[PDB]
Curated annotation (Swiss-Prot):
It comes from Homo sapiens. JQ1, a thieno-triazolo-1,4-diazepine derivative, and I-BET, a benzodiazepine derivative, have been tested on tumors with success. Treatment with GSK1210151A (I-BET151, a I-BET derivative) has strong effets on mixed lineage leukemia and promotes myeloid differentiation and leukemia stem-cell depletion. The NET domain mediates interaction with a number of chromatin proteins involved in transcription regulation (NSD3, JMJD6, CHD4, GLTSCR1 and ATAD5). The C-terminal (CTD) region mediates interaction and recruitment of CDK9 and CCNT1 subunits of the P-TEFb complex. It is also required for maintenance of higher-order chromatin structure. The chain holds residues 53 to 168 of 1362 of the full protein. Interacts with p53/TP53; the interaction is direct. Interacts (via CTD region) with CDK9 and CCNT1, acting as an associated component of P-TEFb complex. Interacts with RELA (when acetylated at 'Lys-310'). Interacts (via NET domain) with NSD3, CHD4, BICRA and ATAD5. The interaction with BICRA bridges BRD4 to the GBAF complex. Interacts (via NET domain) with JMJD6 (via JmjC and N-terminal domains); the interaction is stronger in presence of ssRNA and recruits JMJD6 on distal enhancers. Interacts with NSD3. Interacts with NIPBL. (Microbial infection) Interacts with bovine papillomavirus type 1 regulatory protein E2. This interactions may serve for the tethering of viral genomes to host mitotic chromosomes allowing successful partitioning of the viral genome during cell division. Chromatin reader protein that recognizes and binds acetylated histones and plays a key role in transmission of epigenetic memory across cell divisions and transcription regulation. Remains associated with acetylated chromatin throughout the entire cell cycle and provides epigenetic memory for postmitotic G1 gene transcription by preserving acetylated chromatin status and maintaining high-order chromatin structure. During interphase, plays a key role in regulating the transcription of signal-inducible genes by associating with the P-TEFb complex and recruiting it to promoters. The record marks N88 as: Acetylated histone binding. This is Bromodomain-containing protein 4. Ubiquitously expressed. It is linked to Cornelia de Lange syndrome 6: A form of Cornelia de Lange syndrome, a clinically heterogeneous developmental disorder associated with malformations affecting multiple systems. It is characterized by facial dysmorphisms, abnormal hands and feet, growth delay, cognitive retardation, hirsutism, gastroesophageal dysfunction and cardiac, ophthalmologic and genitourinary anomalies. CDLS6 inheritance is autosomal dominant. A chromosomal aberration involving BRD4 is found in a rare, aggressive, and lethal carcinoma arising in midline organs of young people. Translocation t(15;19)(q14;p13) with NUTM1 which produces a BRD4-NUTM1 fusion protein.
Length: 116
């Protein structure tokens, strides 16, 4: 008894607060922009990494209403941190960074709205 909508307020939140909150983070630098796997010297990054994901690509999918619901934006956020876990063994600064961005991103989603 309900037609699916593009859940824009959670996605809004994920864009407005989360995205920007992450974006601005001490640890957001490799996520704001997409890693040049040549730049950080990552010969197997686009090899190992499932789908190298950045707050940029994510801010894209959010503000371009590509996301149908926040959880995809979240899973891209999770993806973002998980690629960092995928490549960099858990305990690497970038994972640790992602890990601090997780508790920050997930901070927001811990407070993620529900559509009226
Ligand atoms: C963009 O996030 C990163 C990914 C990888 C694979 C390595 C590093 C790194 O060696 C230092 C900072 N960030 C990294």
């Amino acid at each position: 008894p309900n037609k699916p909508k593009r859940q824009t307020n959670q996605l809004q939140y994920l864009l407005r607060v989360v995205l920007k909150t992450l974006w601005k983070h001490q640890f957001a630098w490799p996520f704001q922009q997409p890693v040049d796997a040549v730049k950080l010297n990552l010969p197997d990054y686009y090899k190992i990494i499932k789908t190298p994901m950045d707050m940029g690509t994510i801010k894209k999918r959010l503000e371009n209403n590509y996301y149908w619901n926040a959880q995809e934006c979240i899973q891209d956020f999770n993806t973002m941190f998980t690629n960092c876990y995928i490549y960099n063994k858990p305990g690497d600064d970038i994972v640790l960074m992602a890990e601090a961005l997780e508790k920050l991103f997930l901070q927001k989603i811990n407070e993620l709205p529900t559509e009226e």
